[PDB]
Amino acid sequence: LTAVVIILTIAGNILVIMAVSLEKKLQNATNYFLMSLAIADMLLGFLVMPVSMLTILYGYRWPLPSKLCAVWIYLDVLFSTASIMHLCAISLDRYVAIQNPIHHSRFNSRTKAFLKIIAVWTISVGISMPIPVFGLQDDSKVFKEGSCLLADDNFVLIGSFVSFFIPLTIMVITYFLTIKSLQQSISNEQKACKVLGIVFFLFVVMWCPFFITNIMAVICNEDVIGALLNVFVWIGYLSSAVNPLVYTLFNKTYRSAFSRYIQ
Numbered sequence: 001l002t003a004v005v006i007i008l009t010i011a012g013n014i015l016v017i018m019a020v021s022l023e024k025k026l027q028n029a030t031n032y033f034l035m036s037l038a039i040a041d042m043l044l045g046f047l048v049m050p051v052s053m054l055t056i057l058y059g060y061r062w063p064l065p066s067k068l069c070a071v072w073i074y075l076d077v078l079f080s081t082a083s084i085m086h087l088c089a090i091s092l093d094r095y096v097a098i099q100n101p102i103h104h105s106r107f108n109s110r111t112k113a114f115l116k117i118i119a120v121w122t123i124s125v126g127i128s129m130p131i132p133v134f135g136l137q138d139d140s141k142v143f144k145e146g147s148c149l150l151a152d153d154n155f156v157l158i159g160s161f162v163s164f165f166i167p168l169t170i171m172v173i174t175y176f177l178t179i180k181s182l183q184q185s186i187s188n189e190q191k192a193c194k195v196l197g198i199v200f201f202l203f204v205v206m207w208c209p210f211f212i213t214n215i216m217a218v219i220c221n222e223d224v225i226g227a228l229l230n231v232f233v234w235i236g237y238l239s240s241a242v243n244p245l246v247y248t249l250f251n252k253t254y255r256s257a258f259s260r261y262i263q
């Protein structure tokens, strides 16, 4: 079951890589931010998920060297954060595009896309900047009874608040403002509302339980909490596996590209 998620991740990300890099009609500023998101989930699907499957297969005892535990957790907080701020920036851009379309089109450029990519990756690197320089030289953030689990309450609580919950409330405000703003064109607006709702509720359903139970594991019968964490982390990874699909399949050109490249 676990091996299915890794394969789905690599395939669904390589498909959008090939669809944006080898299709003239889809070379746009928005498709390049989607390209960056796909790159983030692509790296997450190879540098993290195989190692997580290895940990599940072996158990808590980890055959890889203890020195390597610090950087493998650093990649999780790097790539998963990067994807989360990618989604947050996409929602903000959609709100600017739907609420004020003339001005968005006036300000739309490739420079804005590069600025967005630089900003989200800078923020992701900054949030995960404590862990390697505080974890390689000690056991504070890297180890807890031979589990290779992030065991720093100062960073688990504070880190999640900036990495997930600030983006989460930004996304909820953005969704409520957009759906309050889209109220032949009427059917298009209804389909846009449908897509926005589906995407937002997928992201919330798939990432919210992990961080809630992670906070509860620190504030708070922890044996069941450990297993729930161990399942919801994989749910979170499956979200990054899915995200390239739902953000692109609705577009006709992307759907045709996936139909053709799969042949």
Ligand SMILES: CCN(CC)C(=O)[C@@H]1C=C2c3cccc4[nH]c(Br)c(c34)C[C@H]2N(C)C1
Pocket (backbone or CB within 6 Å): 072, 073, 076, 077, 080, 081, 082, 084, 148, 149, 150, 155, 156, 159, 160, 163, 164, 229, 230, 233, 236, 237
């Ligand atoms: C190494 C695997 N692992 C052990 C089960 C984890 O807990 C990993 C730790 C994580 C974490 C902790 C704190 C703040 C955070 N922000 C973001 Br985004 C993440 C995060 C991603 C999250 N990923 C999915 C699991």
